[PDB]
Design an enzyme around this catalytic site. Structure first.
Site, short mmCIF file in Angstrom:
data_model
loop_
_atom_site.label_atom_id
_atom_site.label_comp_id
_atom_site.label_asym_id
_atom_site.label_seq_id
_atom_site.Cartn_x
_atom_site.Cartn_y
_atom_site.Cartn_z
N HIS A 25 -7.55 6.87 -2.29
CA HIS A 25 -6.17 6.50 -2.00
C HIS A 25 -5.39 7.81 -1.83
CE1 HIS A 25 -2.73 3.53 -2.70
NE2 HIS A 25 -2.15 4.69 -2.44
N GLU A 29 -7.35 -4.93 -4.67
CA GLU A 29 -7.60 -3.50 -4.85
C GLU A 29 -7.90 -3.15 -6.31
OE1 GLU A 29 -5.46 -0.18 -2.71
OE2 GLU A 29 -4.40 -0.14 -4.64
N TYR A 78 1.30 -10.01 11.53
CA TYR A 78 0.35 -8.91 11.66
C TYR A 78 -0.45 -8.90 12.95
CZ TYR A 78 1.33 -7.34 6.93
OH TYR A 78 1.96 -6.83 5.82
N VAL A 96 -5.21 -3.97 9.27
CA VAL A 96 -4.86 -3.94 10.68
C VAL A 96 -3.61 -3.14 11.07
CG1 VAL A 96 -3.45 -6.03 10.72
CG2 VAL A 96 -4.76 -5.36 12.76
C1 LIG Z 1 -2.92 4.40 4.51
C2 LIG Z 1 -1.51 4.97 4.09
C3 LIG Z 1 -1.07 4.64 2.62
C4 LIG Z 1 -0.17 5.67 1.97
C5 LIG Z 1 0.29 5.46 0.63
C6 LIG Z 1 1.75 4.85 0.34
C7 LIG Z 1 2.09 4.68 -1.21
C8 LIG Z 1 2.31 3.24 -1.71
O1 LIG Z 1 0.95 2.72 -1.55
C9 LIG Z 1 0.70 1.58 -2.36
O2 LIG Z 1 -0.13 2.00 -3.46
C10 LIG Z 1 -0.51 0.92 -4.33
C11 LIG Z 1 -1.33 1.51 -5.46
O3 LIG Z 1 -0.50 2.16 -6.42
C12 LIG Z 1 -1.30 -0.12 -3.55
O4 LIG Z 1 -2.47 0.49 -3.01
C13 LIG Z 1 -0.44 -0.67 -2.41
N1 LIG Z 1 -1.20 -1.63 -1.64
C14 LIG Z 1 0.00 0.49 -1.52
O5 LIG Z 1 0.90 0.00 -0.52
C15 LIG Z 1 0.65 0.41 0.79
O6 LIG Z 1 1.62 1.41 1.15
C16 LIG Z 1 2.98 0.93 1.14
C17 LIG Z 1 3.88 2.11 1.48
C18 LIG Z 1 3.15 -0.23 2.12
O7 LIG Z 1 2.93 0.22 3.45
C19 LIG Z 1 2.16 -1.35 1.78
O8 LIG Z 1 2.25 -2.37 2.76
C20 LIG Z 1 0.74 -0.79 1.74
O9 LIG Z 1 -0.16 -1.81 1.31
#
Ligand SMILES: CCCCCCCCO[C@@H]1O[C@H](CO)[C@H](O)[C@H](N)[C@H]1O[C@@H]1O[C@@H](C)[C@@H](O)[C@@H](O)[C@@H]1O
Ligand SMILES: O=c1ccn([C@@H]2O[C@H](COP(=O)(O)OP(=O)(O)O[C@H]3O[C@H](CO)[C@H](O)[C@H](O)[C@H]3O)[C@@H](O)[C@H]2O)c(=O)[nH]1
Ligand SMILES: [Hg+2]
Ligand SMILES: [Hg+2]
Length: 263
Positions: A151, A221, A64, A130
């Site tokens: 979110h 989270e 990262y 980051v």
């Molecule tokens: C700031 C842009 C985020 C857009 C949303 C992508 C959808 C998947 O998000 C995931 O959602 C779960 C909750 O249901 C958690 O919040 C995860 N930490 C989220 O993951 C994030 O998005 C994914 C696509 C990936 O980039 C992960 O590394 C990131 O933490």
């Protein structure tokens, strides 16, 4: 504290909302920050008169560290420009932190991996991921004792769809009939005191879960959401502040894309 100077700007219209397509205030009277709801000139005046210092914390371990250059370069162009900013980069590779040129009144501290330090160096703490980049203005309109960010995947979803931790055995448990919003752990903050209260609460809750052999569905989270459900944030940031254009495009409801994921 001190009086604002004479300012010339459009008169607010009581019988004319700024935004009619979105909720701009929560049921507990906390503003929901969307473009069009704030006059940044008035807010900048208010916070500059207080000589506000904002701390921006990020963790960059292992691979990262590669995201730091773009993160910092774009923060310099869009984050709290005009105000005092102190970046705190927690990393396992101090020598790997890029040498980014900072504007005046802005500093960066590299911490290799006490909290009393924050209390003496900044007024507000903003905690973000980051692997992101700033694409538009992110300023003092977000500052308040405690804030969370909607979110991007659930701002238009029913609470039953929120991916809260649903197991009663977990301290982050939230039943299907509870919940205001689903906040993303990638962007939250507030006064140093409130942020430390939140992190201490989250840490203790996670330890309890560990002792009972359970891990929340979305880790930190999940606990962040439990905390904000029981301790309402004083401001909520719209998805303008946490977006992914490749996965979600650019909806009409979002007038600006301010802080986004890096592909
Ligand atoms: C700031 C842009 C985020 C857009 C949303 C992508 C959808 C998947 O998000 C995931 O959602 C779960 C909750 O249901 C958690 O919040 C995860 N930490 C989220 O993951 C994030 O998005 C994914 C696509 C990936 O980039 C992960 O590394 C990131 O933490
Ligand atoms: O130095 C780091 C490491 C991870 N993350 C964030 O962590 C989230 C995912 O979870 P973990 O931090 O637990 O790390 P993994 O990538 O191993 O999963 C990512 O979305 C990313 O935004 C950071 O911000 N900084
Ligand atoms: Hg933080
Ligand atoms: Hg948390």
């Amino acid at each position: 504290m001190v009086s604002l100077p004479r300012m010339v700007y459009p008169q607010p219209k009581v019988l004319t909302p700024c935004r009619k397509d979105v909720l701009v205030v929560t049921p507990w009277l906390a503003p929901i920050v969307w473009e069009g709801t704030f006059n940044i000139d008035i807010l900048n005046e208010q916070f500059r008169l207080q000589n506000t210092t904002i701390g921006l914390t990020v963790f960059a371990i292992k691979k990262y560290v590669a995201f730091l250059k773009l993160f910092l370069e774009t923060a310099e162009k869009h984050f709290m420009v005009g105000h005092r900013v102190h970046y705190y980069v927690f990393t396992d590779q101090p020598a790997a932190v890029p040498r980014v040129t900072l504007g005046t009144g802005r500093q960066l501290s590299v911490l290799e991996v006490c909290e009393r330090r924050f209390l003496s160096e900044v007024d507000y703490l903003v905690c973000v991921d980051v692997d992101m980049e700033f694409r538009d203005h992110v300023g003092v309109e977000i500052l308040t004792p405690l804030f969370g960010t909607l979110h991007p995947s659930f701002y238009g979803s029913s609470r039953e769809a929120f991916t809260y931790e649903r197991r009663p055995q977990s301290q982050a448990y939230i039943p299907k009939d509870e919940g205001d919003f689903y906040y993303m752990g990638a962007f939250f903050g507030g006064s140093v005191q409130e942020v430390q209260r939140l992190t201490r609460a989250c840490h203790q809750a996670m330890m309890v879960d560990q002792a009972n052999g359970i891990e929340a569905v979305w880790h930190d989270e999940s606990h962040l959401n439990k905390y904000l459900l029981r301790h309402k944030p004083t401001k909520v940031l719209s998805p303008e502040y946490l977006w992914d254009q490749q996965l979600l495009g650019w909806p009409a409801v979002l007038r600006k894309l301010r802080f986004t994921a890096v592909p």
